[PDB]
Symmetry: D2
Subunit: 257 residues, 4 copies
């Protein structure tokens, strides 16, 4: 249904979860794909499985911490050298934080904002010149419903996310004259390492309880792949008239009309 | 997953514009599609063209007034009889209305309100028994950015469309336990009979369709610098109607080419 | 304060409507109000004249769903109190129903009541408002407009339409100096809540205690029901020159119910 | 507005909206403390205020709100001098003009730090006081940029959004201890910036009043003029006072009709 064989897609934080699910979806659409992450071994393992599942795959995997501008510049340039100028950028890297206002220190605030903001600023700034040389150029920033609907034990992440949402609109407006669309998704509760971590403190039942307590209308946790599909629609020419917007991937958690 | 071969999709107002492009994308995904519309001739013509393009397609088209409760109940009956119980429903908004507040009589207010609300309430109420008996059931209501960002010459339509946007959120929550997801799209300026007619009545005679629409898009400050295409709107609807949006309910997709100023 | 103002309050014989009239008279404004029940209209009228001696007060039976009545009410206000500078639209109730429970008739009824209770008085009173200084319209509304609730489907929808209409009127009327804003009430103390308290099973909590636990149970952060006077104070702010750079907006009077940032 | 029983703290109170807020609180009979970075600016302001309000209970101290210890000492000084604080108002430092392309990492960090800590520090320092008082309320001054960004205010818009989100979380968290929290969203308000821009205009023929009217039309402000600090101050006062006793986790629009959102 979606044919991205012409595309060169970059995914930051692509070695697991939503990022990996996104990379998988991209290879399947025949796109040349590049992904980065900090952990080299998980990165190469993921890389091997990908090449397995997708024999022809044009795939480039590189260690890179998006918090380091210098690393991001080098990653962008190595991407261009290996696959050509990027046409798609998915900023996924990120790690939520559990804290009330009372529990969040200045140090934790700074860390939270720096992570949520620069994991988007760095890759966008380093790859924009490649994006703006390509047709069907699109950026997708992964975000959470917290950005528009805060939760009590996610005070700092919710506020940082809000900033990043606002930034997506600004980037959409700024880049539109150069042909680059910019959107994001707002995930709800999605199965993750963290949620299996908590479980260890059947699984498909302890989660059902969680979704029931969390009042998720669809009555289950989200799947990484589902987040990936919204990303894919937004990254692809299927949404060519959509920019400066978000797709809700929360299972009906947004109380707002 | 854009393999909708086992889906039964219903599109109200599907003989033209966004409705028609949605039907095409549905047939193309292999779904069995039913659609209705008022103009019989328009409906028939679009029907035969669809069958040429999609040989072997399971397609049921019937003249229907969605504002008429009884007609809609009958059209739902024929749909289940003809294709089987619906799994997807797409309510394709009637039309807009150009009017400031000062220019909107009581009669125009009523007419606008009833159109936007009942064009959704009737099909939904009628097909709900069907949608709720299926798996992967979804409803998409076609709406406009006017719903959350009003425009001066579209006062009544914006207000009516806000109501429907709100109702979409309610239906999603209410139908959730039964497996039926409910979303909308929010179109911007999208090529249509209205813009086509507006281009016929234009003052700038020197300009052709291509030039006039670009001038219009610039004048409207559309960041993407052009009017939307019905197929683009149809594509967002297809995503929301399909299992690809399986964890998305009570929401909307923006199809306005960057017109929404809200963050 | 508002002694130079002519304030009209549609639906002003009880609840938030009456509370707004009370505040307006207190601010020293000439005040007009309408409602359907003449008996209650006049009882309210009679109490207010006592409470506010020498008050410039005009009260009249009017169904806001009837254009010609609203028109007659507007003409009468001008003859009696002079040209209107402030308009508060309050008329209308809430309807309890799921989507399933809501008939076509009920939908039509709700849409009619919510919309025309605003459209009619605004249209009838605009010419007065647009010849006055410091002219303002306030449309009473509910958080339901942006955050619908399950057993209030039809009302939530019509309220959202009216909310969107407030934005359009603000933008439309601003060249002629008329500001337009609304409020979004949460759970407010009504005779209907008094009803339930009276028949509590079979607690020893007084009104304030029972209402407090009810609020916790409805997860209102502020931990109690809203009082008509609190809605009225926001209306007063929005009606008055104190909010002269505020148009096309809403003030949240829900006690913290809005989940949206 | 009888706030004679109130003790109100205004960070950023030496000029603009902050000073208009300080004046309104004082007219309302409240004990008032404010802080600022420029000593000379703060002193001049403090002095003028005393001449205006003879006998006022007024404390003013230089303080960098980005410095947690200065803020802490300031909060100590406020309590010892005026008594426990019951009202806190956090005035937005200022806006930064640049596009995304124009914003360096450094600019991004200071912009985020400024907007976030200018709220985080005073809240955390004063909260123990606020929760000791009835009718306690916090107001955070913000901009419409938080929900409706503008192209030459990219970093500030995003930082404003973060802070608007935070206001919702703080109202929910502090609600149990009786402290309400809200903000305001200013549009274009007369200020040093605009006076500066007026001073460097092409059309010298236009004076201040004519120029801002034209500017207002150009910016498509429905009310057709720039706001005045006193207008922002009046909305902050409403939100700070018992008049808004059932309002928390919210914002009041003070943009003159610039919000396109219904
Ligand atoms: O759920 P996680 O926190 O594990 O994040 C999901 C993905 O994002 C990556 N990621 C997290 N932080 C960074 C970072 N700072 N720079 C680049 N990639 C990152 C992770 O790889 P990794 O944890 O190896 O960085 C992982 O692939
Ligand atoms: O909660 P309620 O409707 O009981 O209160 C709202 C107020 O508005 C008035 N009101 C309700 N409907 C109308 C109407 N259609 N026209 C004029 N006033 C109205 C009511 O007075 P009343 O019930 O007398 O109309 C009431 O005093
Ligand atoms: Cl998160
Ligand atoms: Cl209601
Ligand atoms: Cl600003």
């Amino acid at each position: 249904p979606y044919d991205l064989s012409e595309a060169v897609a970059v995914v930051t934080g692509g070695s697991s979860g939503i990022g990996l699910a996104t990379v998988e979806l991209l290879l399947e659409a025949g796109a040349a794909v590049a992904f980065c992450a900090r952990d080299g071994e998980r990165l190469r393992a993921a890389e091997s499985a990908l090449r397995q599942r997708f024999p022809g795959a044009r795939l480039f995997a590189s260690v890179c911490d998006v918090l380091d501008a210098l690393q991001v510049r080098a990653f962008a340039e190595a991407c261009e050298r290996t696959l050509g100028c990027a046409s798609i950028l998915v900023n996924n890297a990120g790690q939520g934080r559990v804290s009330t206002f009372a529990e969040t220190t200045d140090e934790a605030w700074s860390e939270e904002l720096q992570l949520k903001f620069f994991s988007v600023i760095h890759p966008v700034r380093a790859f924009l010149p490649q994006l703006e040389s390509r047709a069907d150029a699109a950026i997708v920033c992964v975000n959470s419903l917290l950005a528009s609907q805060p939760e009590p034990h996610m005070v700092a992440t919710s506020a940082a996310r809000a900033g990043v949402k606002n930034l997506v609109r600004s980037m959409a407006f700024e880049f539109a004259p150069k042909g680059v669309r910019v959107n994001g998704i707002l995930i709800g509760l999605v199965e993750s390492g963290q949620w299996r971590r908590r479980f260890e403190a059947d699984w498909a039942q302890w989660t059902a309880q969680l979704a029931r307590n969390k009042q998720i209308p669809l009555g289950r946790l989200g799947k990484p792949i589902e987040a990936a599909r919204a990303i894919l629609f937004l990254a692809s020419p299927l949404s060519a008239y959509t920019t400066g917007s978000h797709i809700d991937v929360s299972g009906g958690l947004s109380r707002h009309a």
